[PDB]
Symmetry: C2
Subunit: 890 residues, 2 copies
Amino acid sequence: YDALLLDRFLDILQDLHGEDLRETVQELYEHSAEYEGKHEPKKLEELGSVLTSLDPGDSIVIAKAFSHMLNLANLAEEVQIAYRRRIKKSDLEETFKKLVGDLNKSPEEIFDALKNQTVDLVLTAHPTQSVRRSLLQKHGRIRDCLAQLYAKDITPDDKQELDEALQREIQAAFRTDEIKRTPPTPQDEMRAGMSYFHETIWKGVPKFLRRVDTALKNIGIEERVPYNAPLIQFSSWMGGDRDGNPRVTPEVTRDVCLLARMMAATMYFNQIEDLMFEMSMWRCNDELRARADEVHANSRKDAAKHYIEFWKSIPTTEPYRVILGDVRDKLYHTRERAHQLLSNGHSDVPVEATFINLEQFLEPLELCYRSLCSCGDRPIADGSLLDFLRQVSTFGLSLVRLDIRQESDRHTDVLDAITTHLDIGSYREWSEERRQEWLLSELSGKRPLFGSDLPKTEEIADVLDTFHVIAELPADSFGAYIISMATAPSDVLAVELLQRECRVKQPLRVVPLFEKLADLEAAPAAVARLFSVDWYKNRINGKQEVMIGYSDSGKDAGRLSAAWQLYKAQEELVKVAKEYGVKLTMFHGRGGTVGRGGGPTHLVILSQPPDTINGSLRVTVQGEVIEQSFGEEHLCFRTLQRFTAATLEHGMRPPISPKPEWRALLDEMAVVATEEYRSVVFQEPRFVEYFRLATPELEYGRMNIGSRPGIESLRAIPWIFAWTQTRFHLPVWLGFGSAIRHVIEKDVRNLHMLQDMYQHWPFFRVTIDLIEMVFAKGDPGIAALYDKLLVSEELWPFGEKLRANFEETKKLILQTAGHKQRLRLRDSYITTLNVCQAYTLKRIRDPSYHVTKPAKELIELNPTSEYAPGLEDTLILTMKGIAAGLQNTG
Amino acid sequence: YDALLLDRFLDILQDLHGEDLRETVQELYEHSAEYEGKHEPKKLEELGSVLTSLDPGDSIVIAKAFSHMLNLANLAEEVQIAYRRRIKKSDLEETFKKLVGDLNKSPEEIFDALKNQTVDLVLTAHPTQSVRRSLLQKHGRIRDCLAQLYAKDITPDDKQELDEALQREIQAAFRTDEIKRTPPTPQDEMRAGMSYFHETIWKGVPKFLRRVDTALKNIGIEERVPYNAPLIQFSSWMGGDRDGNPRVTPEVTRDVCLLARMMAATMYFNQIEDLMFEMSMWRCNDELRARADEVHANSRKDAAKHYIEFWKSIPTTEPYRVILGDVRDKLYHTRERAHQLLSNGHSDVPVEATFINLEQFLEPLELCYRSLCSCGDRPIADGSLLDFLRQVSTFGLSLVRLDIRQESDRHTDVLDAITTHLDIGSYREWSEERRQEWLLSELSGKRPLFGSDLPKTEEIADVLDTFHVIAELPADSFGAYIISMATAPSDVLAVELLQRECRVKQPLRVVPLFEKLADLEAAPAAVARLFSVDWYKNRINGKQEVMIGYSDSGKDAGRLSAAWQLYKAQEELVKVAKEYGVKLTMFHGRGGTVGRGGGPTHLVILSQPPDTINGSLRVTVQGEVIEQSFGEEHLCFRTLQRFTAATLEHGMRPPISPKPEWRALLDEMAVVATEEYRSVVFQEPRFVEYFRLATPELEYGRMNIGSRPGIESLRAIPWIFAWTQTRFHLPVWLGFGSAIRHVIEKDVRNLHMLQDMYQHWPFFRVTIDLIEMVFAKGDPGIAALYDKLLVSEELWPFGEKLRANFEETKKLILQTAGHKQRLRLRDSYITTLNVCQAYTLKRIRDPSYHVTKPAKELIELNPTSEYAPGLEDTLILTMKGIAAGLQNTG
């Protein structure tokens, strides 16, 4: 079945660049097949020799070719998955049955626990999406074609037109420049973000909700999930996260908020006329009759000719249409107000003529639902009206609530500017106690703090002006204020005060970020200290959110020690929240790659300590993962199912709590594992050098993915990227070797205790299984070749040391899991690109191949290349392709 | 399979009005089943006795019930048809094969004849659509549900959710008031009209075109139909036809034209961003490169924040996106200009910033197509870009070109006002010669005719002001000026002059309407006289359109004589056009019912005389027929296929031309048939009386269908309606009895000549077969019962005379066809309603049952009824239901 795509693509490629190039591509495919089969390391050089011959443009064409072959492989994978799963005629219905049978839980327990369950998915613009949007669209169309082909109801002409469509759409994909030639703006990132709504999420949410209703009815629960029950929500960082991104200005946040508002208004307006058409009943209760008579009293006997449907005054014969008609007029004026506010600087639209409340919108729709139920029309109510209620209660007036992020030291800079200007001292130099005392006195105080005449840096005015921008806009457009590098309560109190002082009418909730390992060790203490403050615990009103970073933890210490300290951290934070009677929601800053805390969703949810969620979970969806989980109706649904099921099960089926022996064993194991990790990544004086030679880290910035302009000082994203490209994955497995070996050395029964832990502690099982996954996607011969081609003869054995540890560690990993479906083939493609990526790097770091109108061929596409004409494009193509093949960037 | 719908509906009905009403409905269904089975006329009275017991509201519920059961039957019919035809894995591919095999015609002949073929479908607001739009939507949803159920890939939960959807949507259908309580405005009619575009036609056209491309490729023609080849077009009368409709004012025409323009702009704008996303190539020819450099020169380095996608200035890396980007800016400014022009009286949008030309739009898209083909991207060009080209070239800047219709005497009134005001005589009193002479002298003249100070009636100013309104608006928004009751050339020259004098910058083509039988007899002569005028033949530029009415012809004379004079008329008109070297296109004013020239499309096209079409055909789609042929993707496609196939075959496979014996035989037969028809419908002095008693004609106006406020003096629509409701169909078959009997009496070999004609003359075959269809949908027992319940004892035998003729005529009909699939059952339902319609009429025409807040039950729905509270609603319900059951209103 697989050979279909190869055949079609190679045929098109021959139509575009000749038989010769198709033959050389086939030669590469066969050499790589012999490598991923026989694994003779000579085969890699044998392929590279074939590669060194290519013309400057021909090599570009080769990299393009294997890249698009990989992408096609991913799409066929998704389709074959959706079909293999659909031809079944964890899982939602399965999870209900297991909760009833296994645990003897009742249906009404499931339903009541489900009403009080919340999952807040927040989308982020983290620079991990390798593929440009201009291509992602074509990907969507191609997966649609392959979806329609994989069926046995094809009618001849449909099949031929679908072959023409698939061919023309592949060719259109190949005819686009893959290289972002300029990096995007934050607003472009927000556009890429919201695209998944008016494409998949907008219609995807109601369908998923209906499916939940169906499942509850298969359990015997005729009742339906409340439309206002908040089973899912969406937040976004796109355009708000300004941590280290000076390109995200206050006006950027304004722009994206007005944008989202206008989008929501538009979608609601396109829907509202269809809904009005359907709501043509004449029976209603006396309540809705009174209301409809109200609106028809001020119905304004006017033309209203701009409208398409229902342009005439709406008769009382159809009352639901009257109420919905006012809903339309307010919706129209909303879209028009936002439309002018965005196009120009202003609108003449009066705010009373718009929806100002999250639920001045909802109230009339609720009234409609009540009326329908009163008259025996509950089936009618649970149709388009219900879908519309759920859509309103879920996306509101601005599709997502936007988070604003900033580092503590910027708040500290603003405050120190204020105390210096007030001739009272230096907030910086002040002890944390002094800071708390002053901040408290000013929060309870009633006098304006600074005035118009406050001296402001560009930075100071940046943070102040983002606060003013928050104040100027509606409250229901924002989510939370996230403080990076939060250490003490003064860091949060600073934000609360700055909000109040910037006249933020309804200040938003403040939430800290603990991302560095030390900050996580100290986090429960610092949160406890914050809850100690009687004023702040009084203002927080029994609810508090705190974020837990996964990216940087596993970067400065071992991956293992990161995970274990993360489990401990969640546990102890829940301890503090329970002690102070405050409902904690924990915000998990997970990535897509295991190296930044990633993994399959239900597994990483199961690996959280029990009684730490309790119907409140918040998770980052890091850029690239967004496309992975919302680019198709099926993907969106499977994602929402996976998340909600994992949460409900983790609620009613709490994972086992560890025995103390396992606790201490993990503490020792973590000391040894961290010493193992830092021994190679920081003690070795030549390690940074070898890293800057053997991995493609430094070139990452050339892909122009995001808008953000030693090894401790780099972002975690190119860190896991660099080692994932080379298929070595050092930051995933490093400490495990010395950890397991030292633990077995100290005591022999520790092997029986390891076998005990792998089969009974969910967190440990998840960890080891994930490490086994990562080993399955690795090949040390690759790292060997990179060393052979780019690393100087001197420290060749260093990598070999690592290569030793690699195998050694793998031996231990399987040893705890007790291990010893025929996908393969794709690695062949990946292997080819690996070779291409290695040799090309060698030519880039040379003096002969350095540099000292329109475009009608690929080589003319990069004129501003400081390297040789055909090279930079080829390297970027290799990185893109390998990422897409491994199904992970960083 | 049929019993499914009965089961679901009766279950819902029991949930809504109790077991008792479901049982009484079942009783009615069984009695009607025994009638449509055994046909004992006692069964009708036996059912009526059961009906006389009902409460006032219960009878309303019964009529509602059988009406909705009938509608459900129609929908299940359409679905079972689409499935029965789809499970085949005339017709388009069949027609190609028959044209090649049978007639030895070549592929390139088919393709070249197809390039030069045109079909102009014009939609009309004729008051024949019985069902209110508020219900038609629910019909659409229900046929979607039944479409998804009829498949064997149902997944359990999908089936249950579809049962909930079908149930809730049926219930929503039943919960709406079926009675239009106020008749619509012309603009409401235009809204109902255009709804089929932004629902079915807009996407339906490109799919059909692609299918034609596929068929041509299965013939060996790799080439694709030119995007600008006009294989289909759309016109509309909605909002322009003012013949006898004083509610259609000039401002109405303005309103609907600005409306359509805004709609088109909207649809194009929603599409344009997706198309821009796909057109991401970097290769182009030097032509398009030069153009893209032009637009990027004035690209206006500006924010353009109102836009969603591509809000930033478009780079030259993606040139197609640049050109399409300007296309977007002009499209946006167009939608906004029309939007303000409609909302208020004006717009500040400059006309240069909009598309003013039908093809200032098309030119950049053509340039894109050329570029794509130049670079080997013809597959890409034939995708979304092609669909978009065809959409532009087919719908233009205002979805349909609107026709304006008016009677000659209104033009005559205006002119006579002008000559009276000029103190030169009376245009009315003038001989046709004098009229022609003066009109010619003024058309060639250069002086303003009337001035500001012309005395104008409300009527005079109506016609003048509609001319000014035509002049004020863009030319590509209108189609043709249709003159009702056209008799001479002065009638057309009047319109040409009135256009010129009203400063109509690009005057539109004038086209006459010959609808009365005398006007059709005299039509070829009058058209010849018009072509004689050297000036007008010079201005017409070798193209002329003339309309041929079918409605009124078969109303004043026999149906047969109508058809035969119609054939003669088409033939002789083509004669005149050929003689004067002018390309004639004939505009066929056909209805949906056979009584107004209706029938299955390919049959009524085959029954046109050969060499009368020649790649130019224009057909009315009378209101109700619109829903019948465009309410579903499948219906729209099958309609466009049926029409285009019938036309192409009638072009390359000309139907046989009649022998002279058949000509004269039809002339005699037509004299006898017309004498037969007028003998009963006009000679009988009591016929009008019996018609006003035995048929529901007079009550037609109560259905509030359209916006238009002896028997010779009524519209043809309630004429065929009245006889079709009662299932008697007198105007379809009347003259055939005496015609055939006299023809066989005059000569015995005329029977052999009739058998000869039925098997070899397509027109005659179509006629007899249609009459046989109409007999199949008739039941004389119904007319008997109506007579028994409403007609006075005196002229009871009169109808029986007719009933004699009926059977007698039927005997002859089968006798010429040589005749002697198990659908039935639906007639049972229809029969019930027939009984309901009869008895209820009797109670309405009584003195006891005549008349001398909110609403919470059906009886409160008609408070302004001059008849008894529960009655008027019941009658209207019967008429609606019977119409839907017979699948024809009038």
